[PDB]
Copies of this chain bind each other. A is one copy, B any other.
Amino acid sequence: LVKQELEINQQLSQRLITATENGNQLMQQNIKVKNWLERALQSERNIKEQIAVLKGSLLLSRILYQQQQTLPSADELENMTNRIADLRLEQFEVNQQRDALFQSDAFVNKLEEGHTNEVNSEVHDALLQVVDMRRELLDQLNKQLGNQLMMAINLQINQQQLMSVSKNLKSILTQQIFWDWIKAFPQSLKDEFKSMKIAFLAGLPLLLIAGLIHWRLGWLKAYQQKLASTPKAILIDLIRALPVCLIILAVGLILLSELLWSFSKKLAIFWLVFGLCWKVQTSHWRRQIVRISLALLPIHFWSVVAELVLGQAMIFFNLLLIAFLVWPMCRESWRDKESHTMRLVTITVLSIIPIALMVLTAFYTTLRLAGRWIETVYLVIIWNLLYQTVLRGLSVAARRIA
């Protein structure tokens, strides 16, 4: 009888010791986090004051880079809110146990029931003393746990505030950053090189979807050929391109790695644009679109991490290549004067962007406009295709009405 009480008391003491050690570690971590958060708040206020008066300062970019490098990483925060609920439940359980053991005499009388053959005058006193000691230890552990829970709640509030502050600091750095060299780059090349050094279920369903979609697309192509011999053929080609794009996007998502997710998000539209030519001279265009797709892919790779000087080395040549490719089209367009040149304006804007990106990058945020330029080009192409389809449909409807 007394052995069980002694074992329970020992278990309670061990639990209290472990909880106290965890509370001390958490308090130390919370104090370190609070110190870092105060430092960050002071630094953010200082940076805001400076940017209020440090307008148009190239070296201020270096200062902002240093400040960002000084910012601590908030990703190491442990969302122990579940542990906080566990502590609250443990405290409630301890309170319930203490309330059950509040009446030491009643508890001893209840425990002595059906055990009078092993209970004596000394046994009752020993049981009462053990119950009192267990109650005292439970009260001490409950107080320690409540103090630890308060400290953890304060730490969680401080950690949330510090994460918000770091996010706001990143936002402010971006807002401030919003608005010879090659010889130095030879040495920086080595530095850059040194700097370099459910999913299975989704993948299998994607494989089965593609396996079925092979025959589905065969049947769809047969149906499209039967219907055409065209707006119907164009719609069928668009639908066929859409299923392949969806399958590729699902495969990429299963394969995704933060940069990979945004890369696939852009690659959805990129592959849609690429397959628009595959599903729709046209034969000459079907072979010449490979260069455009490859150029978009390097641009996608160089601009994926933007929205979230080595990287511009490929872009410097890509801009010149795009300008050279547009030059033959402009020369062909320049041969016609009375003909409409509505699409030349978009081509001229795209070429100006390729020239500006490679010219003004020698303040350095000129590469940001490329993301909008690519989207504008894609929108213009989609608008032209939709206009052609609408013209064909209107002609068909007018012929039918006549």
A contact residues vs B (CB 8 Å cutoff): 57, 59-60, 63, 66, 85, 89, 92-93, 96
Residue of B nearest to A89 (CB): B59
In the complex, A93→B59 CA distance in Å? 11
A96 to chain B, nearest CB (A): 7
- Can you report 7 A-B residue pairs in the complex whose CB atoms are below 8 A from each other? A57-B89, A59-B89, A60-B89, A63-B89, A63-B93, A63-B96, A66-B96
Lowest 6 CB-CB distances: which A-B pairs, in order? A59-B89, A63-B92, A66-B96, A57-B85, A57-B89, A60-B89
By a CB distance below 8 angstroms, the chain B residues around A85 are: 57
By a CB distance below 8 angstroms, the chain B residues around A63 are: 89, 92-93, 96
In the complex, A96→B66 CA distance in Å? 9
Sample of 7 more A-B contacts, CB < 8 Å, known A59-B89, A63-B96: A57-B85, A57-B89, A60-B89, A63-B89, A63-B92, A63-B93, A66-B96
In the complex, A60→B57 CA distance in Å? 51
Residue of B nearest to A88 (CB): B57
In the complex, A63→B94 CA distance in Å? 12
In the complex, A63→B90 CA distance in Å? 11
By a CB distance below 8 angstroms, the chain B residues around A66 are: 96
A88 to chain B, nearest CB (A): 9
In the complex, A60→B93 CA distance in Å? 10
In the complex, A59→B89 CA distance in Å? 8
By a CB distance below 8 angstroms, the chain B residues around A89 are: 57, 59-60, 63
In the complex, A63→B91 CA distance in Å? 12
Residue of B nearest to A67 (CB): B96
By a CB distance below 8 angstroms, the chain B residues around A93 are: 63
In the complex, A96→B89 CA distance in Å? 47
By a CB distance below 8 angstroms, the chain B residues around A60 are: 89
In the complex, A63→B93 CA distance in Å? 8
A98 to chain B, nearest CB (A): 14
A58 to chain B, nearest CB (A): 10
A59 to chain B, nearest CB (A): 6
Residue of B nearest to A66 (CB): B96
By a CB distance below 8 angstroms, the chain B residues around A96 are: 63, 66
